[PDB]
C-alpha cells in the first residue's frame, strides 16, 4: 500500500523520512512534512516535503525533473508537470495522488486544463498553512527563511489571492530588532497608536542602512523602521502596498510625516526665511533635481537626496542600472527625478542662509560648495555620480586648502 493512501496520524516520522530518501536524492532530513487529504466530490492525497536547504544540485540542468510528482488513480504519469506548482514555489518536493485529472488520450500527459489549476491552488494554500505551522517552531523557521526567503518574496510579488497570506511569513530586521528577524505582525503590534504607516528603507546591505541619515528623524519620534537588504524585497513591497490597514512607506522616496499644528506653524515660519537659499540651490543645480525643499526628516545631516515619488529607490536604481539587457541606449529616465532635501538645523545650511542673505548667492565658492554638497548627498543616499572627476577635483581642493596649500 502506498504511503499517501494512509492516515497521517497512523504514519511515523521514519516512514516519511524513508519516502523522502526514496523520492529525493538528498541525504539530510526534510525540514518539514505535510500529509493532507481533501475530500467531498473531488479527492486528492498530497504529501509535501520542505527541504532544509535549496535543492539546487541540478546534475541534469535544463532538463525537466520537476519535484512534485502527479499520480492519477495510483498510477504514475510523468515528470514534466510544470504548471502543477508555481515556479517560485518550485522548491518543495513530494507527490500528489488524485483520480479526477483530465489526462490526454494515452493518459501520459496533462496540459491546458482548468481542473488542475484548482488542485494547484489547494496545494499552494496547504503549503501556506504548512509554512504557518513551521512559523511556530522558530528553530526550523530560521532555516526555512535562510533557505527560501527569495522564493517567499517572489511569491508575495507574484500571487495576489495569497499575497496578504504570504506577507505574514516575511521576517526582516529593524532599528528595534537588530538582533532577531521581526515579522510584520510583530511590527504592527509594536507600532505606536498614533503611527499610521509602516516605514521601511532599502539598501545594499545592513551596514549601509544601519547608519543611514533617513532614520534619525524617525528615531526622534521613536518610529520603528524595517530594513531591506536584498534587491528582491522591493518587488514584494511595491506589490503589498499595505498590511493590516497600515500602508508601506519607503523613507528613501518622497513622503509626508505628519506633525502637530504648533510644529506646522514653527516650520512654516522657518521655511519662509529659506526661500532665497532654496531658489539659489534650485537655479544652481538645474535639472539634476526637481526641487530643493527645506526638509524636517533629518536632524544633523546637512543635505540629502530624496528620490521623488513615481520613481525607484536608491538600491532599486542601483540594481536596475547594472542590467545590461534592460537599457543600452538610455531610453529609461523615470528615476532621474530627485529632490534636494536640506535640514535647517545644520550649521552648514545656516551658514549658506547667512551667505545668501549677505548677497553672495552667485559666489564661486558658494556654488562650488553647493555642488559638492549635492554630490555627497547623492553619495550618502546611494546614487552613483555622473562624473567622479569633478568630485575628485573638489575633494583635492578641500585637501589642499586643509594642508595650507595655495
Amino acid at each position: 500500500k502506498p504511503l499517501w493512501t494512509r492516515n497521517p496520524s497512523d504514519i511515523t516520522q521514519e516512514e516519511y523520512n524513508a519516502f523522502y530518501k526514496s523520492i529525493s536524492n538528498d541525504w539530510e532530513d526534510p525540514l518539514y512534512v505535510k500529509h493532507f487529504s481533501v475530500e467531498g466530490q473531488l479527492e486528492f492525497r498530497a504529501i509535501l516535503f520542505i527541504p532544509k536547504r535549496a535543492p539546487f544540485d541540478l546534475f541534469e540542468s535544463k532538463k525537466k525533473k520537476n519535484n512534485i510528482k502527479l499520480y492519477v488513480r495510483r498510477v504514475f504519469i510523468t515528470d514534466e508537470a510544470e504548471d502543477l506548482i508555481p515556479e517560485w514555489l518550485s522548491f518543495v518536493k513530494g507527490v500528489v495522488d488524485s483520480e479526477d485529472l483530465p489526462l490526454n488520450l494515452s493518459r501520459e500527459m496533462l496540459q491546458q486544463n482548468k481542473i488542475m489549476k484548482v488542485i494547484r491552488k489547494n496545494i499552494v494554500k496547504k503549503l501556506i498553512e504548512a509554512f504557518n505551522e513551521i512559523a511556530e517552531d522558530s528553530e526550523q523557521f530560521d532555516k526555512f527563511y535562510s533557505a527560501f526567503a527569495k522564493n517567499i518574496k517572489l511569491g508575495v510579488h507574484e500571487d495576489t489571492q495569497n499575497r496578504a497570506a504570504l506577507a505574514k511569513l516575511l521576517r526582516y530586521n529593524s532599528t528595534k530588532s537588530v538582533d532577531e528577524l521581526t515579522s510584520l505582525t510583530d511590527y504592527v503590534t509594536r507600532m505606536p497608536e498614533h503611527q499610521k504607516n509602516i516605514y521601511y528603507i532599502t539598501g545594499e546591505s545592513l551596514k549601509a542602512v544601519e547608519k543611514s541619515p533617513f532614520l534619525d528623524a524617525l528615531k526622534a519620534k521613536n518610529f520603528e523602521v524595517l530594513f531591506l537588504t536584498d534587491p528582491i524585497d522591493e518587488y514584494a513591497f511595491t506589490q503589498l502596498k499595505e498590511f493590516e490597514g497600515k500602508t508601506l512607506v519607503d523613507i528613501t522616496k518622497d513622503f509626508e510625516l505628519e506633525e502637530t499644528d504648533e510644529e506646522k506653524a514653527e516650520r512654516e515660519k522657518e521655511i519662509k526665511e529659506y526661500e532665497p537659499l532654496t531658489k539659489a540651490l534650485k537655479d544652481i543645480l538645474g535639472d539634476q533635481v526637481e526641487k530643493v525643499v527645506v526638509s524636517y526628516k533629518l536632524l544633523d545631516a546637512p543635505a540629502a537626496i530624496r528620490t521623488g515619488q513615481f520613481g525607484w529607490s536608491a538600491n532599486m536604481e542601483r540594481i536596475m542600472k547594472a542590467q545590461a539587457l534592460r537599457d543600452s541606449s538610455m531610453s529609461s529616465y523615470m528615476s532621474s527625478k530627485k529632490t534636494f532635501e536640506i535640514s535647517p538645523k545644520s550649521p552648514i545650511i545656516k551658514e549658506l542662509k547667512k551667505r545668501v542673505d549677505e548677497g553672495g548667492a552667485q559666489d564661486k565658492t558658494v556654488k562650488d560648495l553647493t555642488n559638492l554638497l549635492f554630490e555627497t548627498a547623492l553619495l550618502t543616499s546611494g546614487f552613483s555620480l555622473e562624473e567622479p572627476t569633478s568630485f575628485a577635483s573638489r575633494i583635492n581642493r578641500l585637501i589642499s586648502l586643509g594642508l595650507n596649500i595655495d
Binding site: 473531488l42 489571492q161 518587488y235 511595491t238 490597514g245 513615481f310 532599486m316 531610453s331 523615470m334 528615476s335
Partner: protein, 284 residues
C-alpha cells in the same frame, strides 16, 4: 447536457447582486456604492460525471465603486475606485476572500475611504459569494458577430503625463515594442491614425484622446475576421498621496474565442514590456 457552462448565468447573478450594495446611505458623511460589475473572468461549470452535482467554478471578480468621504473643511469629497477579488471558489471560506480595494486618484482626504468599505461593504460581498455556490448548485442541479468585453487594471510607477506621452511617442513606442510601422510622417500619434505593431499581428488605430486622461484605440489582430474590430479605452488615474497610476483598461469588441488570448498578451507585451524597457515599476 452532462456538463452545463454557467459563466453567463454567474455574470448575470453578480450583476444583479453586487450592484446597489451600499455602505450606509447617500446622505451619510462616509458613503460608498458599487456602481457596476466591470468583469467576471474564469469559468463556471457544473458537471455530473461523479454522479453528484458538483461545481468547480474558478472565477475572479472586479467591480467599480463610487462614493464620498469627509474632508478637513467640512465638505464631502467624492471618489471613484475599484474592488477586485482574485479568487472566489466553492471551497473558499467566508474570511478567505481577499479584497484588493483601490481608489482612483487617491489623496490624503480619501484615506478614510479604504477602512469604511472594509467594515460595512466587505461582509456583504463575502456572504454574497458564499450564497453564490448554493444558488448555483440549487438552480442547475436537476436534469458583425457576437463580441465580449474584458477589464484590466495594471499599476504603473510613472506619472500620468509620462505614460500618456509614452503611449503616443512613435520612437518610444518602437522602443518598447521593438517592431512598429507608422504610416504617417508625424513624430507623434494624432487623432484618426493607424499603425501596425508586433510583426503585423497587431493593427491599432487611435480614435480619440484626452490630455493625460483617456486614450481610445481600435485594436484588431490579423487573424480576426474583418467585421470584428475591438475598441480599447485606457484611463489614467494617477494618485496624489502615494503617487501611483492605474491604467483602467476597458476592452470591448473582442471575439468570444480570444477573450483570454487578449489578456495574457496585454500583461506581457503592454505592461511587462513597458516596465522592462522604461522601468515603470518592478517586474520580472
Amino acid at each position: 447536457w452532462v456538463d452545463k457552462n454557467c459563466i453567463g448565468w454567474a455574470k448575470e447573478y453578480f450583476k444583479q447582486k453586487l450592484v446597489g450594495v451600499e455602505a450606509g446611505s447617500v446622505k451619510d458623511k462616509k458613503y460608498a456604492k458599487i456602481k457596476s460589475v466591470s468583469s467576471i473572468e474564469g469559468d463556471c461549470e457544473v458537471n455530473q460525471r461523479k454522479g453528484k452535482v458538483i461545481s468547480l467554478f474558478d472565477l475572479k471578480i472586479t467591480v467599480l465603486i463610487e462614493g464620498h468621504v469627509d474632508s478637513k473643511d467640512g465638505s464631502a469629497l467624492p471618489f471613484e475606485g475599484s474592488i477586485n477579488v482574485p479568487e472566489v471558489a466553492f471551497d473558499s471560506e467566508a474570511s478567505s476572500y481577499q479584497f484588493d480595494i483601490s481608489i482612483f486618484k487617491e489623496t490624503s482626504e480619501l484615506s478614510e475611504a479604504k477602512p469604511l468599505i472594509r467594515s460595512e461593504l466587505l461582509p456583504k460581498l463575502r456572504q454574497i459569494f458564499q450564497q453564490f455556490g448554493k444558488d448555483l448548485l440549487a438552480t442547475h442541479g436537476n436534469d458583425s458577430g457576437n463580441s465580449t468585453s474584458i477589464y484590466l487594471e495594471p499599476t504603473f510607477n510613472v506619472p500620468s503625463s509620462e505614460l500618456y506621452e509614452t503611449f503616443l511617442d512613435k520612437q518610444r513606442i518602437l522602443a518598447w515594442t521593438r517592431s512598429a510601422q507608422f504610416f504617417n510622417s508625424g513624430p507623434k500619434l494624432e487623432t484618426k491614425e493607424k499603425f501596425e505593431l508586433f510583426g503585423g499581428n497587431v493593427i491599432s488605430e487611435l480614435v480619440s484622446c484626452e490630455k493625460d486622461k483617456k486614450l481610445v484605440f481600435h485594436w484588431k489582430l490579423k487573424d480576426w475576421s474583418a467585421p470584428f474590430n475591438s475598441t480599447i479605452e485606457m484611463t489614467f488615474h494617477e494618485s496624489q498621496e502615494f503617487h501611483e497610476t492605474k491604467l483602467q483598461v476597458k476592452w470591448t469588441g473582442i471575439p468570444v474565442g480570444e477573450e483570454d488570448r487578449v489578456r495574457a498578451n496585454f500583461e506581457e507585451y503592454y505592461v511587462r514590456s513597458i516596465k522592462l524597457t522604461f522601468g515603470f515599476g518592478a517586474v520580472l
